Symmetry: C2
Subunit: 127 residues, 2 copies
Amino acid sequence: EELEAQRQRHNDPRRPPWPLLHQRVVLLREGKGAPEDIALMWEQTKHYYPADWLIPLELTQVLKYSSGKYLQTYVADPDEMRKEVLMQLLNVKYGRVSDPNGGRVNKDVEEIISMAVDDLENMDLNP
Amino acid sequence: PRRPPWPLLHQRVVLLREGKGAPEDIALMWEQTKHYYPADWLIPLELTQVLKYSSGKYLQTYVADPDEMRKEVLMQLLNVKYGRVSDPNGGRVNKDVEEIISMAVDDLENM
């Protein structure tokens, strides 16, 4: 179905396991990661884990608390990334996508996502 | 209930690590997650980062007994992994969550 596309990407030998990816993304806010790899890491999560909210939540904190210059150094278009992270969180919140890696969108989770959604919505990362 | 909403509690913890809000609240925050969120891993993970990358300097100033806190965070984490506790709130557990939890337990033990 689309349960096909998922079996294919999941079988991809090149797929970063989610926990190491989450671990890599979490290093960023402390300035200990590979920020030059943000776009790629983001691209990996949209592609391999479009149903996950945890990594998008963490990226939201990266977009929230990083400085404009820092973001513009490492991301080609930051406001476009913002819009994509927003889009993925929205897909999870409204069940457009399912089986989130972070775990089940019980109701608390949907609230933390709403808070991140607000954050994103309230954000403008254009120069 | 005076149970702080999870998103707000989680946000408060993030803020505190990001140098916003009030450091001192640290004990209060952890206190509250223990009491009202015995089964959450999300907050414990963020807290581990605070511990992991805060300076002994900072740590002593704002946390009475830093190392006991560590043990308590490590122990909530371990409870969650081995099914000693149940949701509730905040976040559910699969094999993916199970592994990032272990990563945190790993950071906690090497501290």
